[PDB]
């Protein structure tokens, strides 16, 4: 009865304050009363991040997980990087941490998280491959694409690189790219070992590519 009376009185005061104002005191009093939904509603209406963080740090560990996740999402959508980081740490959700790391465009924290989480390897590698493609380290992009498995656009851009190299009189790079192309096609020869004509044509084309690379080296 006493708890019910006090809670009802504070809820009525908060309801009156919603129409009038004074959101800070009412919200912070409603944090310790009962429901957290109305408090987050008025916080979103007022955009009072520090009070929300006080709620997150003062909330219990095993009940308000979803509310802390929503607060972290609100922080991230408001570019509150440090508060998003602390909320994610309090959540111990590896998926959200990896998403934040890949969105923040850095690798060291992503690297240590990947070491701590052996179940998520390509989730960082593919954005890492994109970042490597953004820079001039094209060979690292090639090896990352080969490790991932997808190669069709990788093969097309490697052919473009070969054309660029042969045009720019850097015949050593052209020979290296031709050798890489021949190795990729021989990796395509990996499919089965039965006497299929695709195997013979791929083998002869690989021999031709190796000879072409040797000609590029000699001409260089």
């Amino acid at each position: 009865n006493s708890d019910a009376s006090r809670k009802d009185l504070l809820i009525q005061r908060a309801e009156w304050e919603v129409k009038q104002g004074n959101w800070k005191k009412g919200g912070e009093l409603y944090i310790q009363a009962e429901v957290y939904k109305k408090a987050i509603e008025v916080y979103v209406t007022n955009n009072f991040s520090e009070g929300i963080v006080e709620v997150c740090r003062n909330a219990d560990a095993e009940t308000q997980r979803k509310e802390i996740e929503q607060c972290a999402a609100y922080f991230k959508k408001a570019k509150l990087h440090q508060y998003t980081k602390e909320a994610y740490l309090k959540l111990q959700d590896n998926k959200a941490l990896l998403q934040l790391n890949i969105d923040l465009e850095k690798w060291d924290e992503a690297m240590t998280l990947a070491k701590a989480h052996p179940e998520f390897m390509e989730i960082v590698k593919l954005p890492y491959a994109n970042w490597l493609a953004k820079q001039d380290r094209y060979e690292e992009s090639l090896k990352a694409y080969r490790k991932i498995g997808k190669h069709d656009m990788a093969t097309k851009m490697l052919y473009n690189l070969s054309q660029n190299a042969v045009f720019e009189k850097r015949f050593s790079d052209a020979a290296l790219f031709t050798w890489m192309i021949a190795t990729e096609h021989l990796g395509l020869i990996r499919n089965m070992k039965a006497p299929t004509p695709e195997d013979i044509e791929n083998l002869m084309k690989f021999y031709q590519y190796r000879d072409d690379a040797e000609i590029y080296f000699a001409y260089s």
Binding site: M157, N160, L161, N164, F167, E168, K169, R170
Partner: protein, 128 residues
Amino acid sequence: KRIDVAEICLGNMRFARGSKAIREQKKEPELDAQLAMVAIQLNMKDEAVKLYEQSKRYDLYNKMLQAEGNWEKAIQISENHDRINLKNTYYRTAQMYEVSNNYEQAILYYEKSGTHVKEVPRMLLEAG
């Protein structure tokens, strides 16, 4: 947007150059690229540009823009879209400057190009 009747007609021009362009361009998965090439062959650049934009193809459009003459526009398109053939575009602009006898611009775009250790001495000895 019909190809078979188009290539039959190109056969009926007795226009060997357009047929050679057809032969060298047919090795492309995208038919829109072939249509844009035929548009170039029949002299309307706007239609070819529209077709290239429709097919999300920029390297062929970058080559066409480099060829027609607006080098700076080609540089901008390459840097904002491809960024891979940017070195080739720089080298081609430097070669164009060398043709225009602008030695200073040629050497400048050489150092902005991938290689400048050997091109600059060669042009300097060619000029003397």
